[PDB]
Short mmCIF file of C-alpha atoms and ligand atoms in Angstrom, two decimals:
data_model
loop_
_atom_site.label_atom_id
_atom_site.label_comp_id
_atom_site.label_asym_id
_atom_site.label_seq_id
_atom_site.Cartn_x
_atom_site.Cartn_y
_atom_site.Cartn_z
CA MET A 4 95.80 -6.47 163.92
CA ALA A 5 98.73 -8.79 163.31
CA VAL A 6 101.42 -8.14 160.70
CA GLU A 7 103.75 -11.16 160.68
CA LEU A 8 107.20 -11.63 159.20
CA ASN A 9 106.64 -14.68 157.02
CA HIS A 10 110.02 -15.19 155.36
CA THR A 11 113.35 -13.51 154.81
CA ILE A 12 116.21 -14.37 152.46
CA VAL A 13 119.72 -15.07 153.71
CA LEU A 14 122.38 -15.05 150.99
CA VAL A 15 125.14 -17.67 151.37
CA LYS A 16 127.90 -19.33 149.38
CA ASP A 17 126.09 -22.71 149.45
CA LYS A 18 122.39 -22.74 150.39
CA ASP A 19 122.32 -26.49 151.01
CA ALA A 20 125.38 -26.42 153.27
CA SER A 21 124.05 -23.52 155.34
CA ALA A 22 120.43 -24.65 155.54
CA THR A 23 121.34 -28.24 156.42
CA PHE A 24 123.93 -27.06 158.95
CA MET A 25 121.31 -24.90 160.67
CA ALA A 26 118.57 -27.55 160.58
CA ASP A 27 120.89 -30.23 161.95
CA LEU A 28 122.20 -27.93 164.67
CA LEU A 29 118.84 -26.43 165.70
CA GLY A 30 117.04 -29.80 165.46
CA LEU A 31 114.61 -28.72 162.73
CA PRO A 32 113.14 -30.56 159.73
CA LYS A 33 115.25 -30.92 156.61
CA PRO A 34 115.12 -27.67 154.61
CA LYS A 35 112.59 -27.83 151.80
CA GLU A 36 113.67 -26.81 148.32
CA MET A 37 111.58 -24.01 146.82
CA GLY A 38 112.88 -22.55 143.58
CA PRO A 39 116.36 -21.17 144.28
CA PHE A 40 115.86 -21.50 148.05
CA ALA A 41 116.66 -23.90 150.85
CA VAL A 42 113.81 -23.03 153.22
CA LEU A 43 114.44 -23.35 156.97
CA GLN A 44 111.11 -23.30 158.84
CA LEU A 45 111.01 -21.88 162.37
CA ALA A 46 108.24 -22.44 164.89
CA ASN A 47 106.81 -18.91 164.90
CA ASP A 48 105.37 -19.00 161.34
CA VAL A 49 108.54 -17.64 159.70
CA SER A 50 111.20 -19.18 157.49
CA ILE A 51 114.75 -18.29 156.57
CA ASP A 52 115.07 -18.85 152.83
CA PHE A 53 118.72 -19.60 152.08
CA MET A 54 119.82 -18.59 148.58
CA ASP A 55 123.15 -18.85 146.74
CA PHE A 56 124.77 -15.42 146.43
CA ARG A 57 125.15 -14.70 142.71
CA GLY A 58 127.13 -11.45 142.99
CA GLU A 59 130.65 -10.60 144.11
CA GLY A 60 132.57 -10.95 146.24
CA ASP A 61 132.38 -11.80 149.92
CA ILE A 62 129.19 -12.32 151.90
CA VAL A 63 128.48 -9.40 154.18
CA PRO A 64 127.70 -11.27 157.44
CA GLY A 65 124.16 -10.89 158.71
CA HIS A 66 122.61 -11.82 162.05
CA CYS A 67 119.78 -14.21 162.91
CA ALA A 68 118.92 -15.04 166.50
CA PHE A 69 116.77 -17.90 167.74
CA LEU A 70 114.74 -18.09 170.95
CA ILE A 71 114.67 -21.61 172.37
CA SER A 72 113.64 -23.41 175.55
CA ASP A 73 116.06 -24.37 178.31
CA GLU A 74 115.83 -28.02 177.21
CA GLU A 75 116.49 -27.04 173.60
CA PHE A 76 119.47 -24.94 174.69
CA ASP A 77 120.97 -27.96 176.46
CA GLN A 78 120.60 -30.15 173.37
CA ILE A 79 121.71 -27.54 170.81
CA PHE A 80 124.72 -26.40 172.84
CA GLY A 81 125.50 -30.09 173.25
CA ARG A 82 125.69 -30.34 169.46
CA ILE A 83 127.91 -27.23 169.35
CA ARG A 84 130.32 -28.87 171.80
CA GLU A 85 130.17 -32.35 170.31
CA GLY A 86 130.61 -31.03 166.77
CA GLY A 87 133.56 -28.77 167.54
CA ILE A 88 131.55 -25.75 166.40
CA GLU A 89 133.25 -22.44 167.17
CA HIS A 90 131.16 -20.35 169.54
CA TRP A 91 131.37 -17.18 171.61
CA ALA A 92 129.57 -15.53 174.51
CA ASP A 93 129.57 -12.16 172.71
CA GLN A 94 128.34 -10.86 169.37
CA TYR A 95 131.83 -9.63 168.41
CA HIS A 96 133.39 -13.08 168.99
CA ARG A 97 135.99 -11.94 171.53
CA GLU A 98 134.97 -14.53 174.18
CA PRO A 99 135.42 -17.99 172.62
CA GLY A 100 134.19 -21.19 174.22
CA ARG A 101 131.84 -19.42 176.67
CA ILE A 102 128.12 -18.73 176.89
CA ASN A 103 126.60 -15.50 178.16
CA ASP A 104 124.05 -15.00 180.94
CA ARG A 105 122.29 -11.98 179.45
CA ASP A 106 118.86 -11.34 181.02
CA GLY A 107 119.36 -14.18 183.48
CA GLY A 108 119.06 -16.56 180.53
CA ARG A 109 121.67 -18.34 178.46
CA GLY A 110 122.96 -17.24 175.06
CA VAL A 111 125.74 -18.10 172.65
CA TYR A 112 126.91 -17.04 169.20
CA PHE A 113 128.19 -19.21 166.35
CA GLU A 114 128.52 -18.92 162.59
CA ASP A 115 126.90 -20.66 159.67
CA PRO A 116 129.22 -21.98 156.92
CA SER A 117 129.13 -18.58 155.14
CA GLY A 118 130.04 -16.62 158.27
CA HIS A 119 126.68 -15.15 159.27
CA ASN A 120 126.49 -14.33 162.98
CA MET A 121 124.03 -16.80 164.49
CA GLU A 122 122.72 -16.62 168.04
CA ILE A 123 120.61 -18.78 170.34
CA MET A 124 119.11 -17.59 173.58
CA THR A 125 116.62 -18.76 176.19
CA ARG A 126 115.14 -15.38 177.19
CA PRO A 127 114.26 -12.34 175.04
CA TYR A 128 116.45 -9.25 175.35
CA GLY A 129 115.47 -7.03 178.25
CA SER A 130 113.13 -9.57 179.83
CA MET B 4 112.36 -28.36 168.37
CA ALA B 5 110.14 -25.30 168.90
CA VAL B 6 112.87 -22.95 167.75
CA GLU B 7 111.71 -19.40 167.03
CA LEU B 8 113.39 -16.75 164.91
CA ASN B 9 113.53 -13.87 167.38
CA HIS B 10 115.38 -11.16 165.48
CA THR B 11 117.30 -10.56 162.31
CA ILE B 12 119.39 -7.60 161.19
CA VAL B 13 118.62 -5.75 157.97
CA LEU B 14 121.45 -3.51 156.76
CA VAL B 15 120.37 -0.18 155.25
CA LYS B 16 121.78 3.24 154.39
CA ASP B 17 119.64 4.90 157.09
CA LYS B 18 118.12 2.73 159.79
CA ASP B 19 115.69 5.42 160.94
CA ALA B 20 114.49 6.21 157.40
CA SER B 21 113.92 2.53 156.59
CA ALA B 22 112.32 1.53 159.90
CA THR B 23 109.99 4.56 159.89
CA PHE B 24 109.03 3.94 156.26
CA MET B 25 108.16 0.30 156.99
CA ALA B 26 106.34 1.01 160.27
CA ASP B 27 104.25 3.81 158.75
CA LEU B 28 103.38 1.75 155.68
CA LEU B 29 102.63 -1.53 157.46
CA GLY B 30 100.87 0.12 160.41
CA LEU B 31 103.30 -1.14 163.08
CA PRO B 32 104.40 0.44 166.36
CA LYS B 33 106.96 3.22 166.10
CA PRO B 34 110.42 1.60 165.80
CA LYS B 35 112.24 1.36 169.11
CA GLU B 36 115.82 2.56 169.41
CA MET B 37 117.97 -0.22 170.89
CA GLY B 38 121.71 0.36 170.78
CA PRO B 39 122.68 0.70 167.12
CA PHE B 40 119.32 -0.64 165.88
CA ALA B 41 115.97 0.74 164.82
CA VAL B 42 113.83 -2.23 165.84
CA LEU B 43 110.69 -3.03 163.84
CA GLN B 44 108.45 -5.35 165.87
CA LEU B 45 106.24 -7.88 164.08
CA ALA B 46 103.38 -9.79 165.68
CA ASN B 47 104.79 -13.34 165.49
CA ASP B 48 107.48 -12.76 168.15
CA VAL B 49 110.15 -11.56 165.72
CA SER B 50 111.72 -8.18 165.01
CA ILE B 51 113.65 -6.77 162.08
CA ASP B 52 116.57 -4.83 163.52
CA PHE B 53 117.53 -2.14 161.03
CA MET B 54 121.18 -1.16 161.19
CA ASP B 55 123.22 1.49 159.38
CA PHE B 56 125.58 -0.03 156.81
CA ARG B 57 127.58 2.75 155.19
CA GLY B 58 130.56 1.00 153.60
CA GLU B 59 130.64 -0.81 150.27
CA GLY B 60 128.74 1.18 147.64
CA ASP B 61 125.14 0.04 147.22
CA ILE B 62 123.13 -2.17 149.54
CA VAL B 63 122.73 -5.66 148.11
CA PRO B 64 118.92 -5.97 148.15
CA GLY B 65 117.49 -8.46 150.60
CA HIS B 66 113.95 -9.75 150.89
CA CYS B 67 111.42 -9.64 153.73
CA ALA B 68 107.82 -10.73 153.30
CA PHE B 69 104.90 -9.97 155.62
CA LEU B 70 101.72 -12.01 156.07
CA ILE B 71 98.70 -9.80 156.75
CA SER B 72 94.92 -10.00 156.92
CA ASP B 73 92.66 -8.98 154.06
CA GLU B 74 91.64 -5.82 155.93
CA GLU B 75 95.30 -5.02 156.58
CA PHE B 76 96.08 -5.52 152.88
CA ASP B 77 93.39 -2.98 152.00
CA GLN B 78 94.81 -0.46 154.48
CA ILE B 79 98.49 -1.00 153.58
CA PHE B 80 97.86 -0.99 149.83
CA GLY B 81 95.88 2.22 150.34
CA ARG B 82 99.01 3.74 151.89
CA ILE B 83 101.13 2.44 148.99
CA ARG B 84 98.76 4.23 146.60
CA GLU B 85 98.46 7.41 148.69
CA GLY B 86 102.23 7.65 149.04
CA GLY B 87 102.96 7.05 145.37
CA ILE B 88 105.02 4.02 146.38
CA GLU B 89 106.25 2.00 143.38
CA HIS B 90 104.98 -1.57 143.48
CA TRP B 91 104.89 -4.75 141.39
CA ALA B 92 103.03 -8.06 141.37
CA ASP B 93 106.24 -10.08 140.92
CA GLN B 94 109.56 -10.40 142.74
CA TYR B 95 111.48 -9.29 139.62
CA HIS B 96 109.50 -6.02 139.27
CA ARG B 97 108.39 -6.78 135.70
CA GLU B 98 104.66 -6.25 136.42
CA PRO B 99 104.25 -2.69 137.73
CA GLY B 100 101.09 -1.58 139.47
CA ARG B 101 99.52 -5.05 139.70
CA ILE B 102 98.56 -7.21 142.62
CA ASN B 103 99.29 -10.89 142.25
CA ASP B 104 96.90 -13.74 143.07
CA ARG B 105 99.45 -16.36 144.13
CA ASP B 106 97.82 -19.16 146.14
CA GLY B 107 94.44 -17.50 145.62
CA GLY B 108 95.47 -14.66 147.93
CA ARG B 109 96.77 -11.16 147.20
CA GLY B 110 100.39 -10.06 147.17
CA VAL B 111 102.51 -7.14 146.05
CA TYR B 112 106.17 -6.11 146.15
CA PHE B 113 107.70 -2.71 146.90
CA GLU B 114 111.05 -1.32 148.06
CA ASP B 115 112.29 0.34 151.23
CA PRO B 116 114.48 3.47 150.92
CA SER B 117 117.61 1.27 150.56
CA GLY B 118 116.19 -0.93 147.79
CA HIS B 119 115.33 -4.09 149.72
CA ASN B 120 112.65 -6.21 148.06
CA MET B 121 109.67 -6.04 150.40
CA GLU B 122 106.53 -8.16 149.99
CA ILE B 123 103.08 -8.30 151.55
CA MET B 124 100.74 -11.25 151.20
CA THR B 125 97.42 -12.49 152.54
CA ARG B 126 98.16 -16.25 152.26
CA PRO B 127 101.24 -18.41 152.90
CA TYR B 128 102.99 -19.95 149.91
CA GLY B 129 101.28 -23.13 148.75
CA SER B 130 98.09 -22.46 150.72
FE1 FE2 C 201 121.27 -10.62 168.62
FE1 FE2 C 202 108.80 -13.89 148.96
#
């Protein structure tokens, strides 16, 4: 038996800005447009479907975390540095300009254009 | 890049109520308590990390969709029926008590205790 998470919606101020930011940074294909969504496809058969928030007022920041290889971490963190992207070792953003070494891996937090708390890491939690 | 979505937070009024509801209904392992989260583990190397969100007034409904086998659909839909769980064929909840046939599969929508728009399906979109 195998119940998979296939997609989840992330509400943002500008779906194209957030989805393209994430695809460019993570080195993924250009988001595909599907109805009101900018669809960001991840490798494990799941997508983040970015959608413009049509309520009021501020976005409540969510959290998405991405598991990547060591080689991918080097390239993606390289884009964080080269692009001047704010980043932090910790989820509460008190440790700017550092990465963490949780689980003997590497991890770092950054935000999408709407302020969601994004995270990349090379080892799963507790591994 | 082979970037995986590893976890995402879902904000709810009661993390234990929502995670237990989803795990019971979908036939998943009992949610694990990790820090402030009730962690719902899916098969494709991703978890939904339910977290208490008790400010604001109402939860702004999100959307998570789960890809399952035909046999799992039969079992999960049987639990939807047995539990008296409200369900709809469509994302806008205009078609109560129907299953949809999108992509030649089967799909249905229902809500968690906090009003998030949950979806189960037997085929990926466009397949
Ligand atoms: Fe995280
Ligand atoms: Fe959906």
